[PDB]
Design a protein around this ligand. Structure first.
Ligand SMILES: *CC(=O)N1CCN(Cc2cccc(Cl)c2)[C@H](CC(C)C)C1
Ligand SMILES: *CC(=O)N1CCN(Cc2cccc(Cl)c2)[C@H](CC(C)C)C1
Lengths: 306, 306
């Protein structure tokens, strides 16, 4: 029993992190096969970030201007290209620890593990979710750029995030591994505002099912509700509207606990209106939305990986 | 910026997990050099656990009764011994991925990362703390026994915990790598009660310093207090008493934020008496005590490992 905010094992990702240095800027890179991926603002200076012309800046750089370093192994750049907001540095040596990887662009509400790195060296791992406003509430310092987010499907590593910048508000924004930003953000030092951050309702419901599995059942009430009447209350408290696809995903959790999804929605509706009365659920005084229904099933069944 | 419950990278530990099977019982083992460590109750059946005589049970076992499996590599046991509550299965092949390791027995209040495993395969990683009652609030299912807890000091892995059993109350108990249980627990299926679980005060203070670093300063008040008057209030709410050694550890955090330790204690005293007024600190509606002062300095400075 028990429930923890659990991250994936980072072993297969640690062997892919390298140190990228262009001039004076140094950040992290992802070494897969004979290609190194890194944020393109590594070619910028402290003064270029206010309004960078990346095309003009990249012209003044050649293959010998970039220095990729894998611990103590010195790599050599053969070709360089700019795919959207990431650089593709083609090197001579293929990474012998390249796992079965895959590039994926996740949707808001999904979760992934972040391997925070500095100077190409792993520092820590934590789990987080893509907020509805396409930001993440992570833990990043200067030099952590190039750190990647990922999921693991048995023997396959699914890279889905690369850290690019910290907003003036304290939240974090990045791209997929093809260089496309999550959200309307651009990689320049300017005031950029994120949208309203709402609560992932389908995740909260999965979290309540995990609570029933682990013994916390005080929030189970006598009432039921309709899908429209729940969304009417949910939108008042800035919650994502629940769809029929969300009910289908929660099917297995409903069958294991014997509690209908609409009955669980009625319990959540009463919690949103009356609060938590100073009590806790799974050791938390707030409603958590960083657990997808698949995360709950995975932790409550013991799913392993390669 | 940002603050997350961060675990250590698990790469160096993943390569040491093996599957141990004695008869019908199968759990996880730790393969370091040519020795495999695992809980000794792997030699028991479902009926032996009520009152096992491990010495008599181990006599009826030989070296060919244990089956250690490292993924797809079949190992062979040459000698077996029982050190307290763990088995030392001496094998023929030395683990080629054995890192610079070290066995340590942590004190209550310290934190470590847990690599939850099933059938010798890693499942997930999370950070937790040794409670004052020598239990941990983890996430373990059946078959997770043998999973280890660890810290990383640059290039050295410090193993400090091996999971042995789940109490009827839902909390978890285990041993160090020498087989000595943390707490007064014994490895048999009987009603065992843990002591009163108190709050690690020195950890809460370090967490409040992390909050000031990240912008949350609403809890900073006008008052100060004495070390005796704070402990008088702390013991009322089941908090660990603060010592002078705790003040010395919080020294660097005091110098970085410019806030005296006793001034931070006065803010905590008012929070314990008046509550949090429905507000949050670092996104939490409760006081967290699973961050040591070293954890805060590590995450707020960017400490990397090998
Ligand atoms: C992630 C990381 O290492 N950094 C975040 C900011 N980087 C520069 C920057 C500033 C403003 C906007 C953008 Cl898109 C990027 C920093 C890299 C070096 C120190 C210039 C650090
Ligand atoms: C950790 C783990 O795999 N298990 C916890 C309980 N194990 C048996 C048990 C029961 C009661 C007391 C003690 Cl010390 C140990 C289980 C191992 C097999 C299934 C017997 C599972």
């Amino acid at each position: 029993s028990g429930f923890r905010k659990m991250a994936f094992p980072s072993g297969k990702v640690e062997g892919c992190m390298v140190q990228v240095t262009c001039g004076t800027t140094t950040l992290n890179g992802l070494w897969l096969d004979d290609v190194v991926y890194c944020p393109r603002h590594v070619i910028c200076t402290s003064e270029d970030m206010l309004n960078p012309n990346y095309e003009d800046l990249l012209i003044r750089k050649s293959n010998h201007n970039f220095l990729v370093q894998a611990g103590n192994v010195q790599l050599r750049v053969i070709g360089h290209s700019m795919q959207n907001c990431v650089l593709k540095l083609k090197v001579d040596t293929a990474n012998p620890k390249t796992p079965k990887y895959k590039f994926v662009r996740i949707q808001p509400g999904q979760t992934f593990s972040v391997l925070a790195c500095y100077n190409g060296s792993p520092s820590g791992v934590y789990q987080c979710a893509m907020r509805p406003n396409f930001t993440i509430k992570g833990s990043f310092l200067n030099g952590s750029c190039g750190s990647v987010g990922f999921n693991i499907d048995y023997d396959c590593v699914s890279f889905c995030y690369m850290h690019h910048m910290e907003l003036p508000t304290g939240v974090h924004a990045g791209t997929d591994l093809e260089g496309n930003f999550y959200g309307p953000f651009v990689d320049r030092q300017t005031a950029q505002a994120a949208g309203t951050d709402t609560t992932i309702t389908v995740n909260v419901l999965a979290w309540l099912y995990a609570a029933v599995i682990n013994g916390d059942r005080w929030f189970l009430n006598r009432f039921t509700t309709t899908l429209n009447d729940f969304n009417l209350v949910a939108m008042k408290y800035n919650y994502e509207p629940l769809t029929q696809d969300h009910v289908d995903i929660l099917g297995p959790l409903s069958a294991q606990t014997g509690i209908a999804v609409l009955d669980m929605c009625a319990s959540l509706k009463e919690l949103l209106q009356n609060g938590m009365n100073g009590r806790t659920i799974l050791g938390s005084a707030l409603l958590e939305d960083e657990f997808t229904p698949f995360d709950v099933v995975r932790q409550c069944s013991g799913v392993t990986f390669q």
